[PDB]
């Protein structure tokens, strides 16, 4: 974590990749820390994509408000992600859309 | 069989109430006229903004109390106390 002299966002990214929330709690979210503008929202988006409940909880405890964070584009990105456990959503979307989906079709909130 | 029948009867009361809410006043032998002639309660309940806020606050308090009670019950169980005591005894011995 101290081996690169990098910003807090990159240390948070590493801790998210390693799935070690205690490290981020004890080494990254400490007294006197400095955070850029809009980095924590990107961290929240990354944690939501990767299904990291502990990191979502920690980010919420540290000033992130879901009312400001969540927009339409972010929700569409969340529905069109791949960095998680397998689900059966695409089959349902194909069934509702009469099985006429082109390759790499993007799912909209209307389809949801 | 008795327990399942009791549960099913209690569940099926709802459809009986709905059916007799959605029916004409007159009985079949004299609804002949009513065929040619053709929810404030009984189905729903329309609420105001202040009372809606009251209901929301009540629900939030209830869910908070539920979680607090569940945590208190879990922490005072015999199994959890035994496990914590064993771990602390091991660390203290070391």
């Amino acid at each position: 974590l101290k081996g690169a002299n990098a910003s807090a966002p990159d240390q948070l990214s590493l801790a998210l990749a390693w799935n070690r929330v205690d490290i981020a709690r004890s080494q990254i979210f400490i007294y006197g820390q400095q955070w850029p503008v809009g980095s924590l929202e990107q961290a929240m988006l990354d944690a939501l994509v990767l299904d990291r409940v502990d990191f979502v909880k920690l980010l919420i405890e540290n000033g992130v408000s879901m009312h400001r964070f969540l927009t339409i584009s972010r929700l569409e990105e969340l529905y069109n992600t791949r960095h998680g456990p397998s689900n059966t959503l695409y089959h349902l979307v194909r069934d509702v859309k009469k099985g006429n989906l082109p390759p790499d079709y993007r799912i909209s909130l209307i389809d949801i | 069989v008795k327990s399942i029948s009791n549960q099913v009867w209690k569940f099926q009361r709802y459809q009986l109430i709905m059916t007799f809410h959605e029916r004409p006043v007159l009985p079949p032998p004299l609804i002949i006229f009513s065929h040619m002639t053709m929810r404030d309660y009984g189905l729903k309940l329309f609420i105001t903004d202040d009372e809606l806020k009251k209901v929301h606050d009540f629900e939030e308090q209830c869910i908070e109390e539920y979680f607090r009670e569940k945590d208190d019950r879990f922490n005072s169980s015999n199994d959890e106390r035994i496990r914590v005591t064993s771990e602390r005894v091991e660390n203290m011995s070391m």
Binding site: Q34, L40, N62, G63, S65 | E60, E65, R68
Partner: protein, 306 residues
């Protein structure tokens, strides 16, 4: 200009919900001038906010500089303060902003809220000119969401969550401190004169708690000791700042080498007259230590002083 400001009726009061933390907390607030009579404020608190008169009044003071204190002491401090406030019916007076000792009392409230369902009346009296978002609070008698997250770039500070109520003191200046101390002291003195439910004839007890601090804390404790009804003062030895010099001067006294602190203008400046005037009335001072003192709990130490 000697406060060349008009006097218009209040424009910002009502309720606020804090968004950003892990909790859902609502706080009542009013924006008022610094000349408001304490009786009007008591009427507002007891009727509009519907608060029963307290059987105890803890008035926490300290240093506004955002500091940090040793672990295993902040836990004892929080436990003692929460227990003393909860077991009795007490009002806590703090600064309100999220800096220094107020941040620690907010943490103490936060850790206690997870384990117990009791409600504690914490009252923050802060100047209006330092709130980071002076807007988003003007809505009269309407809920206004508030962002707990703050950026360190701005010199203004955010009102600490977990506080039950807020009184915002206005003088006319913005971005400046020192506009709420006199109102706080006058309200404390007025509350102390109120008659508790007992018919003995005794008033509401008032105690002062000190953590960290600085130069003005000595003057505050002097004014507490010199008050017409004396107010007991509880001091923490392990804080480090001018509270620690009070703890040191409380020992083996009625040695100017140990008195020298270099804290305020080195040895050139000394608040020795003020420190010795405070130490003259050392029977009302109750320094708390986690070691040799029989009262190892701040909760026990707070009530014993009264």
């Amino acid at each position: 200009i000697s406060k060349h400001t008009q006097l218009s009726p209040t424009d910002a009061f009502g309720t606020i919900e804090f968004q950003g933390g892990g909790h859902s907390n609502k706080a009542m607030y009013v924006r008022v001038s610094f000349d408001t009579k304490p009786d009007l404020l008591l009427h507002l608190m007891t009727k509009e906010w519907q608060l029963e008169l307290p059987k105890l009044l803890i008035s926490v003071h300290g240093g506004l500089q955002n500091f940090e204190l040793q672990p295993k002491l902040k836990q004892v401090f929080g436990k003692g303060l929460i227990k003393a406030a909860m077991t009795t019916g007490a009002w806590i007076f703090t600064g309100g902003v999220n800096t220094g000792v107020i941040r620690h009392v907010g943490d103490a409230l936060k850790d206690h809220a997870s384990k117990s369902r009791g409600k504690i009346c914490t009252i923050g009296i802060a100047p209006w000119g330092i709130v980071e978002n002076q807007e988003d609070l003007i809505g009269r008698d309407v809920v206004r969401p508030y962002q707990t997250m703050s950026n360190p770039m701005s010199k203004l500070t955010v009102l600490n969550s977990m506080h039950s109520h807020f009184i915002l003191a206005d003088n006319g200046t913005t971005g400046k401190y020192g506009a709420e101390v006199k109102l706080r002291r006058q309200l404390e003195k007025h509350i102390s004169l109120q008659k508790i439910n007992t018919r003995i004839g005794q008033g509401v007890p008032v105690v002062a708690l000190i953590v960290e601090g600085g130069p003005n804390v000595i003057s505050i404790v002097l004014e507490y000791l010199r008050d017409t009804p004396p107010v007991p003062v509880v001091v923490c030895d392990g804080s480090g700042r001018a509270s620690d010099i009070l703890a040191f001067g409380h020992k083996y006294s009625e040695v100017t080498i140990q008195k020298t602190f270099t804290y305020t203008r080195t040895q050139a400046q000394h608040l020795f007259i003020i420190l010795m005037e405070c130490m003259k009335k050392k029977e009302l001072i109750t320094v708390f230590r986690m070691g040799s003192e029989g009262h190892q709990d701040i909760d026990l130490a707070i009530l014993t002083a009264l």
